[PDB]
Amino acid sequence: PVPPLSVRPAVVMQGSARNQDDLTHKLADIVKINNQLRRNEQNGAAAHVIA
Amino acid sequence: YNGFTGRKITSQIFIGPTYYQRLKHMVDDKIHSRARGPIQILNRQPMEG
Amino acid sequence: MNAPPAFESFLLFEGEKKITINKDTKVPNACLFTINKEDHTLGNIIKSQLLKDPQVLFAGYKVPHPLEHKIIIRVQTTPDYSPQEAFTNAITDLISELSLLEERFRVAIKDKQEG
RNA sequence: AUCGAGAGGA
Numbered sequence A: 001p002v003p004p005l006s007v008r009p010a011v012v013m014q015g016s017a018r019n020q021d022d023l024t025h026k027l028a029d030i031v032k033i034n035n036q037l038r039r040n041e042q043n044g045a046a047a048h049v050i051a
Numbered sequence B: 001y002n003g004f005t006g007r008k009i010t011s012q013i014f015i016g017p018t019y020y021q022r023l024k025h026m027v028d029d030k031i032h033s034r035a036r037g038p039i040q041i042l043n044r045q046p047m048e049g
Numbered sequence C: 001m002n003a004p005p006a007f008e009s010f011l012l013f014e015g016e017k018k019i020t021i022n023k024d025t026k027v028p029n030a031c032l033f034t035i036n037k038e039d040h041t042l043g044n045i046i047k048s049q050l051l052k053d054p055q056v057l058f059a060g061y062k063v064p065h066p067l068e069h070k071i072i073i074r075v076q077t078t079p080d081y082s083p084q085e086a087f088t089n090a091i092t093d094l095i096s097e098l099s100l101l102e103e104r105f106r107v108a109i110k111d112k113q114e115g
Numbered sequence D: 001a002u003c004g005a006g007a008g009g010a
Helices: A024-043 C040-051 C082-113
Strands: C021-022 C028-035 C056-062 C072-078
Touching: C028 C056, C028 C082, C040 C056, C040 C072, C040 C082
Parallel strands: none
Antiparallel strands: C021 C028, C028 C072, C056 C072
């Protein structure tokens, strides 16, 4: 499950760049690794890298 | 002597010069009250301080 | 920040009455005089002068709160007298005494200055 | 603004 934005609010800081919650960064890491893994399935790959 | 009435005070009073210090803690830097002001983003409860 | 102006202790606020008179219902012939913007000076002199009156049964004053500027004077007299009359007569007596004192001080100052 | 740190108050 991905919590909504109110659980991990992104705040517009003094610098116009938006600030992301810790949960958001962790979810970004999770999405990155999940996408890379899913890529390594649709096209076969060695069991070592998959593990 | 009592200032309000000018009568002598029955007991005699210890009085003399003593070095006193004024500390940085002043009431006007501490007095605080709130009625529905700003709230925190994550939880919607009143801010701190 | 919350400091009152210094003049608040002796200047009457708009609509404020200098003196108010109420009846003390506990006992007969007793009145409470509430005076605004006065302190121990007038209260004490008036109370002592009232105590000098043989027809006054009770005379007292108090400042309800030092941060406020009100004095309450309670006077009880004999049924043949009135607290209002006692108050007026006490003020008149104090004024007479002060006038005599001023005259005699003037005379004494002149005497001392000449020699 | 957030986080942390420090110094303080009762």
